[PDB]
Amino acid sequence: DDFAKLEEQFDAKLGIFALDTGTNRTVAYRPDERFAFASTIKALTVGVLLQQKSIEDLNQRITYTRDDLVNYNPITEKHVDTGMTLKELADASLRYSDNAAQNLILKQIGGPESLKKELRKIGDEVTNPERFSPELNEVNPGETQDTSTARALVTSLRAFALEDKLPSEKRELLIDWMKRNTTGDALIRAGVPDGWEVADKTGAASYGTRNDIAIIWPPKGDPVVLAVLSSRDKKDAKYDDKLIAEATKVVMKALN
């Protein structure tokens, strides 16, 4: 098997779950193994924001300070003095993985405990939001805080984006943001054919953790929802995006 091969080549542990939503055919490799979710949680976070606010209510302007900035603030560092709307925050979070934008959205929805509550509510008993960004990235093997599984992430992302945990106008918003991600070009998008539309959200964390969760659209036909998660044994390990890209190619062969 080809996932074992990738684990060998990249000295890494892979967690994979893919659902072809046309057929309910499934492709799994350690699907229930826990990983740090890292920034993939931002996608679920916006999902819950969208349930809680009208589209029009996303125009509320949030004021913040240098105190709200954390380790990686690519958009949010430009607008300290003008503020950013909730819509703009969602954009930055999803398209740039802006960690302060995440923390700002999370405060707006009642924090990690409230996010977890709302995840439970949608049927997700696995994903365990506990901390703010980037502390949520510090996860040691065996620990369950700020972890989820490939299967749980898939099921949750499908629920917000494709089923009925959002109305269609808000599903369109989330999908547009994730289609237009800037962070993902070497990962899931690198293992799909050009012309197959991809909406994704990436993550990186401790233990060489390197994740991507995606909706993938064939030219016609129903979408595939995929989570490709990875980690490595040393705390300070590097990751290699090619792993996720190669793993994606294996998934697409097994389903097609």
Next chain:
Amino acid sequence: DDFAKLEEQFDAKLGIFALDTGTNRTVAYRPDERFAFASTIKALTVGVLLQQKSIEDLNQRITYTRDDLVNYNPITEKHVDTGMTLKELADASLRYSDNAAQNLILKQIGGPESLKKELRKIGDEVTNPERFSPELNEVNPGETQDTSTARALVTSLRAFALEDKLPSEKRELLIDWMKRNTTGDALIRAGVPDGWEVADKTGAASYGTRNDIAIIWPPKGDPVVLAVLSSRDKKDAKYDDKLIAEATKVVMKALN
């Protein structure tokens, strides 16, 4: 000088114009020399399309056939049966240099002659659109059909993207498409420090024409708008992307 040295190293002719939009300082080398503009005209074409349609009007669906497909159709070739909206065509044209998409868009704006008129309307007397793609790439030395100059391409791209030929929300679309370009990793982007956002559109044509036009946002400060054009003296000449990355490094140093 250093641009000289790059023509020597790569046996090529270079056309450079850069404008630092903050200071109005300029870097030029053969800035008014004509080159085939090749696929860089796609960016201007979207500019015109945006100007002439409401954002909502981009949702118009275009039906097309195999007869609309030409030499290079990475996205359009997948969607003959479903059609594509003008929006999707603008994404295909800009981020993948989909030649069929450019042609479909050119038709909806009234063709090459009509694109010429509109570019004259925005103040560009230099750029000479005359053909559809890929014919526009066949330019022999000394001809003026489907050529422009680095200066004119900088001037025109700035007009659309940064100035007042478009309202901001349309400016945002054009810019985000070009930032997420897939074709340019080895040209201007390879001459710019990682992390600085880069919007660009590439081209390649006969006589080893190899072009890239870009907006570059330095970490803070106003943007630079840059054209690097290049061509060689044999019709079947190969180009080398490294020429454009190296020319770009030169401009960055001349401006700091």
